[PDB]
Amino acid sequence: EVQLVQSGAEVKKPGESLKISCKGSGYTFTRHWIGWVRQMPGKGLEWMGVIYPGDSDTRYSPSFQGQVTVSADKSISTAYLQWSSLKASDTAMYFCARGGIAVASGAFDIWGQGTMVTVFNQIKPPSVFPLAPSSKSTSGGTAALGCLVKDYFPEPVTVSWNSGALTSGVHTFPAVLQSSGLYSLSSVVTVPSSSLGTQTYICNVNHKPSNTKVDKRVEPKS
Amino acid sequence: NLCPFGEVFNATRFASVYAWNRKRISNCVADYSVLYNSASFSTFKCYGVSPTKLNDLCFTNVYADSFVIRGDEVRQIAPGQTGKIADYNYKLPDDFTGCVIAWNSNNLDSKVGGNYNYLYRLFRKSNLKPFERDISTEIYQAGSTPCNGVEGFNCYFPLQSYGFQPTNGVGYQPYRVVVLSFELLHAPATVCGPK
Amino acid sequence: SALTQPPSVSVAPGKTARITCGGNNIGSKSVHWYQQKAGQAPVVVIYYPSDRPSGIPERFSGSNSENTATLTISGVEAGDEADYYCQLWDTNSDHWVFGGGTKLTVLGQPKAAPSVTLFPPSSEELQANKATLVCLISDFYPGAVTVAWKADSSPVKAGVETTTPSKQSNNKYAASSYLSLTPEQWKSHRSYSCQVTHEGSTVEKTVAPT
Ligand SMILES: *[C@@H]1O[C@H](CO)[C@@H](O[C@@H]2O[C@H](CO)[C@@H](O)[C@H](O)[C@H]2NC(C)=O)[C@H](O)[C@H]1NC(C)=O
């Protein structure tokens, strides 16, 4: 049974250090490569570096050389990945993979779970703004109200409409994780345009981590 | 449940050393003493084990690697050796535990006009790590000028043919070589001698 | 060296799917193919030539041309829906190189074009010296779209943040794209446009500063 078992998930602040371990079992640890691959949330795989535990030979990608360190301890069959100063852009999954031999020479035949590394700067309450439905929305048609919830940390943020009284036509989109490390989503409700001017639309946005809740009025202007 | 050693040793065609063939052996019993007892092999050298001790020992796995090389290149199939075969085609680890067997195969692998089916790697930017195998055919860049798939000045095809002729000397004979690797892995022992 | 894969590919069950990986002399280099199902670690499905790892069905195969490496899955099953990656060895620099990835979706339900709603910045946000354009895309399948933002009629690259498509409760997919920009450039252009491309068909929505 060939296996690569990686350390648990980590949550660190920017500028801090980090060292993840990755232990191999079921094979001769010193007779294979050990590489590190990065996967940003929802993005593709990126090779970072590789170490041969037999003679501690290291190869680095140009995009990662100097920003991260790869090492190994063959006495306990473990490989290490190390950051000296973390950035918000380092939030990602990190797989360690064994480098095959024979027909598998150029490939990575065995993989671990991956280690989730989250760089969290501060618990930030969200900024809530209205998304006006339209101009000349006129009777007899549908209109899309919304509110945009920007720059909050962490997940989740919960949105209801009219304190839960409005359920038909509501859709809360999954949030985007901006390169700044903060989240942003939007919530949209489809209502009869006739009710724009008679019925008021109240969006309720709750941030559990920041003890924050905002009630935003959505109302056409001009 | 005898180990299929006749499948590898008595196989009709071997592979080129750059693309050597690997066979995994497990879940069988093998009389290794019978292999040496036949005296048809010119080279039979073992590292980490004595030939008689094979029948008295068990291992997690066995690996049989087969290829064809030149006679004077058989000395390269050994730990810590150098040369184009050991560095570019087939490398053995410094702590290798196993055996190397080599025998003359002139009557089969040599043809009049030259046997151009057996190849080897002549150029490579870096040495192979142990038990690795490189079968890429990318044009080698011997100079500063990038080749970009164009063979020419300081840009050579990475593989060269052996060209075995029955009239060749003992140094440039085709020798068929098998390497037996023995693996102990903190797992059940699947290959055992008659013990 | 740049390895290029189509972002997505969709096939019907029982037919054959071909995923292509592009580059310069890839047909002469060692290329492998990995499969990664959602939530799992990658798994090797093809080594170089067409050697298969132990346990991989014979319907997976690899082929090559001077400028191309192709992974072929014949008789596609539902369980083959996953992200597929081509990987290069690059013996020149000893650099393992990674493709962009391709989401292979096996059509189980019918196809659905996306519905797009485009929201201009709120007046309160402009008063606060920020501006955000919200492109909300819903009710599409397969779950793979590409979003292009146009300031006026010229393409815009900076300020674009697009989410990964995710499954809705009705088993279709949704996504959003946010264009962040200062109020000055927002007022300085005649219009802004959001292009959503899905299965070769495009939907464009336009908003104006007025
Ligand atoms: C390859 O074939 C040869 C010949 O068929 C095998 O050698 C024979 O071995 C048996 C006993 O195993 C002897 O009785 C014969 O006298 C041998 N013949 C010759 C010509 O030596 C050889 O063992 C086979 N190789 C393997 C690995 O089994």
XYZ file of C-alpha atoms and ligand atoms in Angstrom:
655
model
C 0.000 0.000 0.000
C 1.700 3.161 -1.292
C 0.539 6.290 0.503
C 1.460 9.951 0.986
C -0.109 11.414 4.156
C 0.050 15.192 4.558
C -0.309 17.417 7.606
C -3.563 19.079 8.617
C -5.023 22.339 7.375
C -3.454 25.604 8.546
C -4.749 29.132 9.174
C -2.035 31.800 9.364
C -1.680 35.579 9.269
C 0.241 37.399 6.523
C 3.981 37.595 7.112
C 4.055 34.520 9.350
C 6.023 31.364 8.585
C 4.631 27.958 7.732
C 5.986 24.427 7.385
C 3.858 21.569 6.038
C 4.970 17.945 6.310
C 4.249 15.059 3.974
C 5.113 11.504 5.057
C 5.454 8.559 2.676
C 4.730 4.925 3.466
C 4.610 1.663 1.552
C 7.627 2.384 -0.668
C 11.328 3.222 -0.520
C 11.258 6.933 0.297
C 14.780 7.608 -0.982
C 14.276 6.142 -4.489
C 11.664 8.611 -5.794
C 11.120 12.302 -6.372
C 8.801 14.256 -4.085
C 7.149 17.306 -5.620
C 4.811 20.075 -4.472
C 1.847 21.264 -6.553
C -0.293 24.310 -5.790
C -4.003 24.611 -6.573
C -5.733 27.916 -5.961
C -9.444 27.516 -5.118
C -11.190 26.724 -8.388
C -8.004 27.104 -10.471
C -5.533 24.693 -12.084
C -2.510 22.763 -10.839
C 0.856 24.536 -10.606
C 4.107 22.669 -10.005
C 6.313 24.466 -7.469
C 9.337 22.299 -6.726
C 10.755 18.834 -6.226
C 13.307 17.108 -3.985
C 15.083 13.778 -4.335
C 15.444 12.475 -0.747
C 18.308 10.198 -1.798
C 20.784 13.056 -2.254
C 18.656 16.113 -1.308
C 18.745 17.482 -4.866
C 16.173 20.259 -5.304
C 14.606 21.709 -8.450
C 12.382 24.789 -8.386
C 9.970 26.373 -10.812
C 11.019 29.867 -11.949
C 7.670 31.245 -10.748
C 8.256 29.790 -7.258
C 12.049 29.787 -6.810
C 13.118 31.905 -3.849
C 9.573 32.364 -2.516
C 9.324 28.872 -0.972
C 11.693 26.183 0.323
C 11.529 22.417 -0.260
C 13.428 19.992 1.975
C 13.300 16.411 3.204
C 14.202 14.185 6.150
C 14.883 10.656 4.906
C 15.359 9.274 8.428
C 11.588 9.500 9.031
C 10.465 9.407 5.362
C 9.108 12.958 5.288
C 9.241 15.934 2.925
C 8.781 19.548 4.003
C 7.460 22.683 2.312
C 8.279 25.983 3.997
C 7.297 29.649 3.703
C 9.130 32.395 5.586
C 6.582 35.201 5.020
C 3.065 34.344 3.872
C 0.914 36.522 1.629
C -2.839 36.619 1.117
C -2.216 35.238 -2.393
C -0.803 32.023 -0.862
C -4.266 30.781 0.217
C -4.564 27.470 -1.632
C -4.442 23.691 -1.549
C -0.958 22.164 -1.601
C -0.504 18.592 -2.811
C 2.654 16.564 -2.374
C 3.149 13.909 -5.034
C 5.641 11.100 -5.521
C 7.607 11.034 -8.757
C 7.251 7.742 -10.567
C 10.030 5.622 -11.996
C 10.237 3.157 -14.913
C 7.227 3.955 -17.159
C 6.032 6.544 -14.599
C 9.339 8.459 -14.680
C 8.078 11.831 -15.858
C 4.772 11.625 -13.975
C 3.573 11.903 -10.371
C 1.981 8.516 -9.733
C 0.924 8.905 -6.053
C -0.795 11.899 -4.400
C -1.780 12.952 -0.880
C -4.935 14.645 0.377
C -3.541 18.114 -0.062
C -3.092 20.656 2.721
C -5.398 23.675 2.852
C -3.495 26.850 3.767
C -5.661 29.889 4.544
C -4.053 33.297 5.071
C -6.520 35.429 7.038
C -5.751 39.098 7.671
C -8.716 40.233 9.787
C -12.368 39.439 10.415
C -13.978 42.196 8.319
C -17.704 43.046 8.295
C -19.267 43.354 4.833
C -20.174 46.525 2.969
C -23.735 46.284 1.623
C -24.957 48.354 -1.326
C -28.224 48.342 -3.293
C -28.640 47.004 -6.824
C -31.450 49.077 -8.304
C -33.911 47.162 -10.508
C -34.157 49.313 -13.651
C -35.470 52.571 -15.047
C -38.892 52.557 -16.721
C -39.565 49.144 -15.198
C -43.330 49.723 -15.910
C -46.340 47.638 -14.859
C -46.980 44.151 -16.206
C -43.371 42.928 -16.144
C -40.760 41.478 -13.817
C -37.872 43.397 -12.256
C -34.679 42.259 -10.522
C -33.818 43.902 -7.202
C -30.589 43.124 -5.471
C -27.972 43.963 -2.926
C -24.220 43.538 -3.344
C -22.203 42.416 -0.311
C -18.522 43.269 -0.789
C -15.240 42.928 1.122
C -16.037 40.590 4.015
C -14.037 37.872 5.796
C -14.818 35.051 6.439
C -17.556 33.004 4.946
C -20.447 32.862 5.255
C -22.738 35.831 4.766
C -26.474 35.133 4.938
C -29.093 37.093 2.999
C -32.862 37.125 3.440
C -35.506 39.398 1.935
C -38.156 41.254 3.951
C -37.032 39.345 7.064
C -37.763 36.018 5.374
C -41.242 36.983 4.146
C -40.102 37.131 0.493
C -39.122 33.688 -0.806
C -40.430 33.522 -4.377
C -37.735 34.515 -6.866
C -34.787 34.908 -4.460
C -31.327 33.784 -5.565
C -28.125 34.358 -3.585
C -25.041 33.789 -5.713
C -21.914 32.080 -4.366
C -19.270 34.599 -3.380
C -16.088 35.432 -5.288
C -12.743 35.307 -3.476
C -10.929 38.397 -4.725
C -7.144 38.497 -5.002
C -7.174 40.768 -1.933
C -8.352 37.775 0.129
C -11.861 39.113 0.808
C -15.209 37.706 -0.307
C -18.009 39.327 -2.294
C -21.433 38.068 -3.391
C -24.775 39.462 -4.535
C -28.405 38.577 -3.833
C -31.141 39.121 -6.433
C -34.926 38.809 -6.163
C -37.350 38.868 -9.101
C -40.636 40.632 -8.316
C -43.520 42.145 -10.294
C -42.561 45.629 -11.481
C -46.042 46.795 -10.464
C -45.010 46.253 -6.833
C -42.147 48.731 -7.350
C -43.745 51.806 -5.799
C -46.270 50.007 -3.574
C -44.186 47.374 -1.741
C -40.808 48.160 -0.146
C -37.908 45.732 -0.619
C -35.674 45.231 2.414
C -32.520 43.056 2.108
C -31.151 41.606 5.378
C -27.400 40.708 5.379
C -25.884 38.780 8.344
C -22.241 38.284 9.082
C -21.955 35.812 11.979
C -18.167 36.187 12.536
C -18.269 40.005 12.786
C -21.511 40.306 14.820
C -22.765 42.339 11.880
C -26.138 42.673 10.352
C -27.275 45.289 7.862
C -30.756 46.047 6.485
C -30.544 47.690 3.049
C -33.452 49.324 1.233
C -33.640 48.672 -2.524
C -35.614 51.368 -4.318
C -35.395 52.830 -7.836
C -33.894 56.305 -8.131
C -34.371 59.200 -10.560
C 3.098 -21.436 -8.831
C 6.622 -21.046 -10.223
C 7.798 -17.503 -10.983
C 7.724 -16.862 -14.768
C 11.476 -16.437 -15.180
C 11.278 -18.081 -18.602
C 8.987 -15.227 -19.627
C 11.812 -12.692 -19.193
C 15.045 -14.638 -19.746
C 13.796 -16.719 -22.692
C 11.796 -13.876 -24.278
C 12.157 -13.527 -28.042
C 12.862 -9.782 -28.261
C 14.273 -7.388 -25.675
C 13.948 -3.609 -25.545
C 16.450 -0.868 -26.267
C 18.425 0.200 -23.208
C 16.944 3.706 -23.301
C 13.466 2.120 -23.137
C 14.312 -0.950 -21.035
C 11.508 -3.294 -19.997
C 10.322 -3.816 -16.412
C 8.439 -6.852 -15.095
C 7.021 -7.092 -11.572
C 7.327 -10.489 -9.865
C 5.237 -11.455 -6.831
C 2.991 -14.257 -5.545
C 5.239 -17.112 -6.669
C 8.161 -19.368 -5.729
C 11.412 -19.247 -7.715
C 14.530 -21.442 -7.567
C 17.254 -18.846 -8.122
C 19.979 -21.472 -7.718
C 18.677 -23.070 -10.933
C 19.463 -19.790 -12.712
C 23.169 -19.854 -11.822
C 23.349 -23.634 -12.245
C 22.849 -23.100 -15.960
C 26.266 -21.763 -17.002
C 25.151 -19.986 -20.199
C 25.499 -16.517 -18.605
C 28.767 -14.588 -18.847
C 28.080 -12.146 -15.984
C 26.273 -13.007 -12.735
C 27.096 -10.550 -9.948
C 25.093 -9.796 -6.808
C 25.088 -6.849 -4.400
C 23.762 -7.138 -0.853
C 23.085 -10.878 -1.227
C 24.991 -14.096 -2.029
C 23.664 -16.343 -4.823
C 23.111 -19.357 -2.549
C 21.255 -17.184 -0.018
C 18.528 -16.271 -2.529
C 16.764 -19.623 -2.135
C 16.929 -19.128 1.662
C 15.379 -15.623 1.710
C 12.070 -13.881 1.006
C 11.289 -10.421 -0.354
C 8.282 -8.136 -0.679
C 8.762 -7.656 -4.417
C 11.037 -8.647 -7.288
C 11.729 -6.494 -10.342
C 13.200 -7.860 -13.578
C 14.598 -5.227 -15.941
C 15.636 -6.415 -19.406
C 17.613 -4.694 -22.171
C 20.477 -5.179 -24.660
C 23.836 -3.372 -24.585
C 27.436 -3.782 -25.758
C 29.868 -6.145 -24.077
C 32.301 -3.534 -22.771
C 29.255 -1.596 -21.523
C 28.098 -4.443 -19.250
C 30.552 -3.164 -16.627
C 28.440 0.018 -16.519
C 25.460 -1.883 -15.039
C 26.695 -1.575 -11.454
C 26.279 0.872 -8.545
C 28.256 4.093 -8.754
C 29.330 3.605 -12.365
C 29.547 6.290 -15.056
C 29.246 6.339 -18.825
C 26.479 7.050 -21.273
C 24.499 3.915 -20.368
C 24.707 4.342 -16.590
C 24.121 8.108 -16.720
C 21.677 8.447 -19.644
C 19.905 5.090 -20.096
C 19.825 2.873 -16.982
C 21.176 3.774 -13.535
C 21.489 1.552 -10.473
C 21.286 3.057 -6.965
C 24.310 3.246 -4.694
C 22.571 0.941 -2.175
C 21.315 -1.526 -4.785
C 20.285 -4.940 -3.444
C 19.915 -7.519 -6.187
C 21.781 -9.166 -9.030
C 22.920 -8.415 -12.582
C 22.944 -11.144 -15.247
C 24.363 -10.714 -18.741
C 24.840 -13.180 -21.581
C 26.083 -13.062 -25.163
C 23.271 -12.858 -27.734
C 25.227 -12.526 -30.982
C 23.402 -15.231 -32.964
C 19.975 -13.591 -32.470
C 20.441 -9.820 -32.125
C 23.065 -9.360 -34.878
C 22.132 -9.188 -38.560
C 24.124 -8.869 -41.769
C 24.052 -5.213 -42.761
C 23.652 -4.130 -39.137
C 20.760 -4.493 -36.695
C 19.441 -0.938 -36.388
C 16.508 -1.696 -34.061
C 18.489 -1.410 -30.794
C 19.084 2.205 -29.740
C 20.576 4.131 -26.837
C 20.657 7.683 -25.531
C 23.823 9.606 -26.435
C 22.947 13.122 -25.225
C 21.088 14.391 -22.154
C 21.209 17.612 -20.150
C 21.346 15.849 -16.770
C 22.004 12.428 -15.296
C 19.186 9.969 -14.698
C 18.130 9.274 -11.144
C 18.151 5.569 -10.196
C 15.657 3.340 -12.039
C 14.413 6.244 -14.171
C 13.739 5.812 -17.892
C 13.823 8.557 -20.528
C 12.117 7.781 -23.835
C 11.700 11.345 -25.116
C 12.981 12.168 -28.604
C 13.414 15.925 -28.233
C 16.251 17.433 -30.245
C 19.249 17.920 -27.968
C 20.471 21.504 -27.610
C 24.259 21.281 -27.409
C 24.801 25.034 -27.719
C 23.278 28.424 -26.972
C 21.137 28.347 -30.115
C 17.662 26.880 -29.470
C 16.905 23.982 -31.799
C 13.081 24.219 -31.913
C 12.698 20.705 -33.305
C 15.252 21.332 -36.074
C 18.169 18.893 -36.159
C 21.455 20.415 -37.308
C 24.283 22.604 -36.001
C 24.840 21.796 -32.304
C 21.415 20.115 -32.453
C 21.520 16.315 -32.483
C 18.927 13.570 -32.352
C 19.124 12.207 -28.781
C 19.285 8.525 -29.789
C 21.998 6.561 -31.598
C 21.716 3.049 -33.034
C 24.041 0.269 -31.891
C 24.272 -1.497 -35.256
C 25.249 -5.018 -34.217
C 27.110 -7.114 -37.282
C 27.723 -10.817 -36.580
C 31.403 -10.265 -37.461
C 31.912 -7.781 -34.600
C 34.465 -8.127 -31.817
C 33.850 -9.255 -28.257
C 33.654 -5.661 -27.016
C 30.926 -4.623 -29.465
C 28.803 -7.792 -29.181
C 25.104 -7.568 -28.303
C 24.706 -8.746 -24.706
C 21.265 -9.333 -23.222
C 21.116 -8.084 -19.635
C 18.555 -8.592 -16.872
C 18.662 -6.912 -13.466
C 16.830 -8.459 -10.517
C 15.891 -5.977 -7.792
C 14.766 -7.337 -4.426
C 12.431 -5.225 -2.304
C 11.681 -5.454 1.424
C 8.872 -3.028 2.199
C 7.341 -3.732 5.656
C 4.715 -5.756 3.772
C 3.976 -9.469 3.306
C 6.655 -11.463 1.525
C 5.339 -12.669 -1.836
C 8.458 -14.039 -3.573
C 10.270 -16.859 -1.793
C 12.733 -19.599 -2.569
C 12.125 -23.242 -1.732
C 12.636 -22.776 2.012
C 7.047 27.144 -22.842
C 3.250 27.403 -22.637
C 0.937 24.381 -22.471
C -2.582 25.149 -23.697
C -5.796 23.198 -23.078
C -9.382 24.125 -23.968
C -11.115 25.249 -20.760
C -14.036 22.823 -21.184
C -15.343 19.933 -23.294
C -18.808 18.337 -23.310
C -19.825 14.926 -24.697
C -22.815 12.534 -24.612
C -22.603 9.152 -22.842
C -21.297 6.308 -24.983
C -19.458 8.505 -27.494
C -15.756 9.437 -27.633
C -14.144 12.481 -25.993
C -10.842 13.950 -27.212
C -8.982 16.519 -25.085
C -6.102 18.336 -26.787
C -2.944 19.837 -25.259
C -0.903 22.241 -27.364
C 2.650 23.509 -27.498
C 5.752 23.670 -29.639
C 7.402 20.252 -29.906
C 5.179 18.358 -27.483
C 4.914 15.377 -29.836
C 8.580 14.612 -29.112
C 8.455 15.127 -25.320
C 7.078 12.989 -22.494
C 3.450 13.927 -21.776
C 1.172 12.347 -19.170
C -2.528 12.831 -18.441
C -4.175 13.094 -15.010
C -7.835 12.993 -13.969
C -9.152 14.973 -10.994
C -12.745 14.543 -9.859
C -14.397 17.310 -7.859
C -13.132 17.277 -4.275
C -10.469 14.606 -4.869
C -6.733 14.506 -5.463
C -5.429 14.011 -9.019
C -4.938 10.505 -10.400
C -2.737 9.467 -13.321
C -4.823 8.049 -16.155
C -2.195 7.891 -18.928
C 1.587 7.799 -18.882
C 3.708 8.525 -21.966
C 3.055 6.687 -25.146
C -0.229 5.016 -24.208
C 0.846 2.893 -21.241
C -1.945 2.623 -18.741
C -1.572 2.589 -14.954
C -2.756 -0.518 -13.141
C -6.550 -0.396 -12.919
C -7.243 2.168 -15.658
C -9.776 0.945 -18.256
C -8.644 0.351 -21.838
C -10.974 3.098 -23.104
C -8.309 5.663 -22.108
C -5.566 6.238 -24.677
C -3.002 8.830 -25.707
C -1.853 10.027 -29.117
C 0.613 12.657 -30.297
C 1.460 14.917 -33.230
C 4.354 17.336 -33.721
C 2.497 20.175 -31.972
C -0.201 18.309 -30.061
C -0.972 15.656 -27.439
C -4.480 14.173 -27.347
C -6.209 12.150 -24.630
C -9.007 9.926 -25.956
C -11.788 8.332 -23.888
C -14.029 6.021 -25.923
C -17.495 5.098 -24.686
C -17.652 7.833 -22.066
C -19.448 6.971 -18.827
C -21.044 9.393 -16.379
C -18.275 8.856 -13.817
C -15.676 10.241 -16.242
C -16.841 13.834 -15.632
C -13.768 15.527 -14.160
C -10.902 17.930 -14.819
C -8.189 16.500 -17.078
C -4.610 17.800 -17.099
C -1.689 17.278 -19.469
C 1.775 17.348 -17.897
C 5.177 17.803 -19.548
C 8.544 16.535 -18.328
C 10.807 19.048 -20.158
C 14.150 17.272 -19.889
C 15.850 20.522 -20.984
C 15.393 22.330 -17.650
C 14.146 19.459 -15.428
C 10.867 21.368 -15.091
C 7.638 19.446 -14.638
C 5.113 21.563 -16.560
C 1.359 21.632 -16.073
C -1.463 22.304 -18.500
C -4.311 24.715 -17.937
C -6.848 21.938 -17.380
C -10.037 20.925 -19.180
C -13.397 20.247 -17.524
C -14.911 17.195 -19.217
C -18.671 17.267 -18.617
C -20.802 14.242 -19.505
C -24.234 15.449 -20.623
C -26.881 13.835 -18.417
C -29.516 16.561 -18.704
C -30.317 18.790 -21.715
C -28.401 21.962 -22.597
C -29.339 25.416 -21.307
C -28.138 28.835 -22.430
C -27.328 31.306 -19.629
C -29.475 34.136 -18.302
C -27.482 37.323 -17.683
C -28.309 40.314 -15.473
C -25.959 43.314 -15.498
C -26.020 45.840 -12.654
C -24.280 49.226 -12.822
C -22.730 50.794 -9.708
C -25.108 52.169 -7.108
C -25.276 55.909 -6.507
C -24.266 55.332 -2.883
C -21.190 53.392 -4.039
C -20.182 56.204 -6.391
C -20.638 58.688 -3.533
C -18.229 56.485 -1.591
C -15.595 56.738 -4.403
C -15.925 53.116 -5.572
C -17.563 51.486 -8.577
C -18.517 47.855 -9.206
C -20.223 46.283 -12.221
C -22.075 43.048 -11.431
C -22.658 40.416 -14.130
C -24.820 37.596 -12.752
C -25.136 34.435 -14.859
C -27.720 31.794 -13.984
C -29.556 28.708 -15.230
C -26.978 27.301 -17.648
C -25.644 23.815 -18.400
C -22.952 22.566 -18.993
C -21.356 24.419 -16.089
C -18.658 26.248 -18.040
C -18.807 29.810 -19.390
C -16.247 32.442 -20.356
C -16.774 36.105 -19.448
C -15.282 38.987 -21.441
C -15.627 42.573 -20.231
C -15.657 45.469 -22.695
C -15.048 49.052 -21.662
C -16.793 50.967 -24.434
C -15.866 48.476 -27.149
C -12.206 47.799 -26.142
C -11.429 44.707 -24.023
C -10.778 45.111 -20.295
C -8.474 42.742 -18.406
C -7.788 44.490 -15.089
C -10.450 44.684 -12.399
C -12.185 41.471 -13.505
C -12.912 38.857 -10.827
C -14.901 35.834 -12.032
C -16.169 32.931 -9.924
C -16.056 29.223 -10.707
C -19.416 27.814 -11.870
C -21.312 26.043 -9.091
C -24.405 23.850 -8.967
C -27.782 25.395 -8.156
C -30.635 23.622 -6.385
C -32.262 22.839 -9.757
C -29.048 21.025 -10.840
C -27.984 23.783 -13.238
C -24.999 26.077 -12.730
C -24.508 29.741 -11.829
C -21.614 32.198 -11.736
C -20.837 35.876 -11.261
C -18.293 38.353 -12.600
C -17.378 41.613 -10.876
C -15.622 44.516 -12.589
C -14.165 46.868 -9.982
C -13.223 50.352 -11.159
C -13.012 53.921 -9.897
C -15.874 56.365 -10.582
C -13.679 58.490 -12.867
C -13.204 55.793 -15.506
C -16.824 54.708 -14.986
C -18.053 58.171 -16.002
C -15.397 58.553 -18.733
C -16.750 55.820 -21.054
C -19.894 55.766 -23.179
C -20.924 52.280 -21.999
C -19.736 49.023 -20.445
C -20.533 45.517 -21.681
C -20.468 41.986 -20.258
C -20.122 39.095 -22.732
C -20.998 35.593 -21.520
C -20.010 32.793 -23.901
C -21.523 29.326 -23.414
C -21.363 26.404 -25.872
C -20.400 28.662 -28.765
C -23.268 31.122 -28.207
C -22.774 34.575 -26.700
C -25.036 36.866 -24.674
C -24.056 40.518 -24.220
C -25.474 43.052 -21.770
C -24.672 46.773 -21.717
C -25.023 49.492 -19.064
C -24.404 53.237 -19.137
C -23.256 55.801 -16.548
C -26.336 58.064 -16.909
C 15.110 -21.157 -20.991
O 15.051 -22.360 -21.770
C 16.121 -23.278 -21.500
C 15.967 -24.422 -22.478
O 14.600 -24.756 -22.675
C 16.077 -23.717 -20.037
O 17.200 -24.546 -19.753
C 16.796 -25.904 -19.458
O 16.455 -26.093 -18.076
C 16.040 -27.432 -17.765
C 15.644 -27.437 -16.306
O 14.967 -26.240 -15.948
C 17.162 -28.419 -18.081
O 16.696 -29.744 -17.853
C 17.620 -28.266 -19.527
O 18.756 -29.089 -19.770
C 17.973 -26.812 -19.819
N 18.353 -26.644 -21.212
C 19.478 -26.028 -21.592
C 19.710 -25.937 -23.071
O 20.273 -25.565 -20.779
C 16.118 -22.497 -19.126
O 15.962 -22.893 -17.768
C 15.021 -21.504 -19.503
N 15.114 -20.308 -18.680
C 14.437 -20.152 -17.537
C 14.655 -18.857 -16.816
O 13.681 -21.018 -17.106
